mmCIF file of C-alpha atoms in Angstrom:
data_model
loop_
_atom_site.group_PDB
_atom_site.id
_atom_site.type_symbol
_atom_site.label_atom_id
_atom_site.label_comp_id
_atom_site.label_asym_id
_atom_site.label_seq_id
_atom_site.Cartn_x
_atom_site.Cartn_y
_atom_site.Cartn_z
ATOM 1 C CA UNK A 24 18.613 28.423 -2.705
ATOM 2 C CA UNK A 25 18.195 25.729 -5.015
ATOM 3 C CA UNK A 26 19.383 22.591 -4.245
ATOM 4 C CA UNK A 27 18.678 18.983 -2.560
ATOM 5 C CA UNK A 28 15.941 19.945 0.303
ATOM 6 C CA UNK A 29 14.193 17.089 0.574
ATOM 7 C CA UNK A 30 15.454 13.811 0.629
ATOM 8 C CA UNK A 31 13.296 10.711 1.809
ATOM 9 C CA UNK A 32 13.784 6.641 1.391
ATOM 10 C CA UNK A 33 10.934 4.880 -0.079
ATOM 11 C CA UNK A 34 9.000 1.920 1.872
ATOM 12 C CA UNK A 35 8.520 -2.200 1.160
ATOM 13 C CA UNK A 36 5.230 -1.702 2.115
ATOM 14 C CA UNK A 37 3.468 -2.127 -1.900
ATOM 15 C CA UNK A 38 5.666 -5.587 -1.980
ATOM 16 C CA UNK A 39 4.152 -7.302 1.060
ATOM 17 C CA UNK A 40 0.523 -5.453 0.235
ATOM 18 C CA UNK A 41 1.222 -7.030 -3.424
ATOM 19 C CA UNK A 42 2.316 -10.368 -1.694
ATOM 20 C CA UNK A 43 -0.804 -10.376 0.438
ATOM 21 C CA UNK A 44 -3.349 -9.335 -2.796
ATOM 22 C CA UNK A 45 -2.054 -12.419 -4.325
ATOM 23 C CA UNK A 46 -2.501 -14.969 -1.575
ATOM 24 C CA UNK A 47 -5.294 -12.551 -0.405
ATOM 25 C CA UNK A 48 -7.987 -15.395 -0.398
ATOM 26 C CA UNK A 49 -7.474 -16.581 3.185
ATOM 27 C CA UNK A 50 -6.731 -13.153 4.682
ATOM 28 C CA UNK A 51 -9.710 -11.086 3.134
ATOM 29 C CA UNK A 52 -8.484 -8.059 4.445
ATOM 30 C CA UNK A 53 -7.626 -6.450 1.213
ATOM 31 C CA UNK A 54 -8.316 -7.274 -1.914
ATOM 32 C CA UNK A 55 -8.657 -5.964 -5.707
ATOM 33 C CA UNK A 56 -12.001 -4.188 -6.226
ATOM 34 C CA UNK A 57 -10.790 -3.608 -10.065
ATOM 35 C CA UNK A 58 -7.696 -5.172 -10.932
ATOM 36 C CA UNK A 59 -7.292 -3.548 -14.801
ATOM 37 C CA UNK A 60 -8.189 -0.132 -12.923
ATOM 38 C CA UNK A 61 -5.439 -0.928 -10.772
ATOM 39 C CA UNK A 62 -7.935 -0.065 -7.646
ATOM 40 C CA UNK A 63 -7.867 -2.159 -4.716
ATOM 41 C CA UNK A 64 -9.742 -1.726 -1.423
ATOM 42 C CA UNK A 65 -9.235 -2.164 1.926
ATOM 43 C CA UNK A 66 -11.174 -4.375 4.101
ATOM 44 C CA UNK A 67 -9.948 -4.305 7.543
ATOM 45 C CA UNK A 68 -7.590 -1.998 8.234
ATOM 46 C CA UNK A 69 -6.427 -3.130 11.137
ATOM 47 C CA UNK A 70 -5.722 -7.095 10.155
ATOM 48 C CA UNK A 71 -3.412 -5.439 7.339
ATOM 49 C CA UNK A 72 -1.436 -3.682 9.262
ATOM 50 C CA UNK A 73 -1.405 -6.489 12.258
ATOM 51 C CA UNK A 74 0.470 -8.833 9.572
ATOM 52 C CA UNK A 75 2.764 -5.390 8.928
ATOM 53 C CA UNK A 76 3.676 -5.308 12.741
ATOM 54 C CA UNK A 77 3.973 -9.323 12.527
ATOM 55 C CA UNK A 78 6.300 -9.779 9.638
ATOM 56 C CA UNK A 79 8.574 -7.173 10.883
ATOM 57 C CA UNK A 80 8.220 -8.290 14.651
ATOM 58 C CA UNK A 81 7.040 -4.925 16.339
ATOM 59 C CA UNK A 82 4.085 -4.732 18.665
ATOM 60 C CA UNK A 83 0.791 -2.278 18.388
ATOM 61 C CA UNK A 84 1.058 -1.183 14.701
ATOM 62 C CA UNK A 85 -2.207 -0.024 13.243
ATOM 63 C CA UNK A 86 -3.186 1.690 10.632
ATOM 64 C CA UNK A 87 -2.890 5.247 12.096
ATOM 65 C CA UNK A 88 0.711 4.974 11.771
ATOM 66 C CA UNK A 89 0.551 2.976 8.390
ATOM 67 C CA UNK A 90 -1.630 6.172 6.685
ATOM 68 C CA UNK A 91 1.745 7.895 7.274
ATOM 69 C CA UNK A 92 3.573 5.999 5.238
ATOM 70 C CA UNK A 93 0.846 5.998 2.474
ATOM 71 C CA UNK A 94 1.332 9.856 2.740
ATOM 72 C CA UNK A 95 4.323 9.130 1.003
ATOM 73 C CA UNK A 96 3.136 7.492 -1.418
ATOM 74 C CA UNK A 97 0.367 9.976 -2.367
ATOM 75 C CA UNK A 98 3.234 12.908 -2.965
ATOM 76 C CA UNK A 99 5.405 10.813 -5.586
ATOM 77 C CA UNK A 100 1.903 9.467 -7.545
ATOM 78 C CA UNK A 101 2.041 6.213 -6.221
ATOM 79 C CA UNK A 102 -0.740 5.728 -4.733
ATOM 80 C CA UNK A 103 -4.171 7.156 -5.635
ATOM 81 C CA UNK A 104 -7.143 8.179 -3.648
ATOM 82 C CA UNK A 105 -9.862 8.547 -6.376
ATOM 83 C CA UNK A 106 -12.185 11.836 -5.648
ATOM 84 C CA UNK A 107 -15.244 10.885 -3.951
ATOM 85 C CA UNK A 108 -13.472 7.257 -2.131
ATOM 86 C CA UNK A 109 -11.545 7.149 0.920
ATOM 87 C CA UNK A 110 -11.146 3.768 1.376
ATOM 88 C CA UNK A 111 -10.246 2.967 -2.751
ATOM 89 C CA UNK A 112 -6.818 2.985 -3.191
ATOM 90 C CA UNK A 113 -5.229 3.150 -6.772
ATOM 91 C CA UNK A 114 -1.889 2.382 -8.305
ATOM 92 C CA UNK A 115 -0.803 5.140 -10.407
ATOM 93 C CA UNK A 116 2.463 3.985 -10.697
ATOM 94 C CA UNK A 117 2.393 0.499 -11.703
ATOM 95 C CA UNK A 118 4.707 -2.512 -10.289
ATOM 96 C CA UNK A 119 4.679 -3.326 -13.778
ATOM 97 C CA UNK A 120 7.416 -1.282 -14.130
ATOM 98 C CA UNK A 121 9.371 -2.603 -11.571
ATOM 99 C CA UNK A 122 8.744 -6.647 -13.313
ATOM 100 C CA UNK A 123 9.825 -5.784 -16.812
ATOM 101 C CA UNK A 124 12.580 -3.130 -15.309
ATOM 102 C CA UNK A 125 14.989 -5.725 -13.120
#
């Protein structure tokens, strides 16, 4: 019975989110709304995951389809939706991590 049941590949998304959050003053559809707290919110839902569909060149992608992929991220402690917010999202695993680990 016990053994490898579920086995899933991780997204790109947090880079290009990450990407966007740092050049995020002419796109104002997401931005850090505490950036020690490691909270961000999103603006417009739908402009963030327009530039999603863009950069990877596929038509109608909104953020119905995007909320699966943050599904994801909720089950390995990713990312955070703090009791009482819907629309904060926070980092609970840091790309910190990720810097000072390659």
């Amino acid at each position: 019975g016990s053994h490898m049941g579920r086995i899933a590949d991780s997204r790109l998304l947090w880079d290009y989110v990450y990407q966007l959050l740092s050049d995020s003053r002419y796109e104002n559809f997401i931005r850090w709304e505490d950036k020690e707290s490691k909270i961000f919110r999103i603006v417009d839902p739908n402009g963030l995951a327009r530039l999603w569909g863009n950069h990877k060149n596929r038509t109608n992608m909104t953020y119905e389809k995007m909320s699966r992929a943050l599904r994801h991220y909720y089950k390995l402690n990713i990312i955070r939706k703090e009791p009482g917010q819907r629309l904060l999202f926070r980092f609970m695993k840091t790309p910190d991590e990720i810097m000072s680990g390659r």
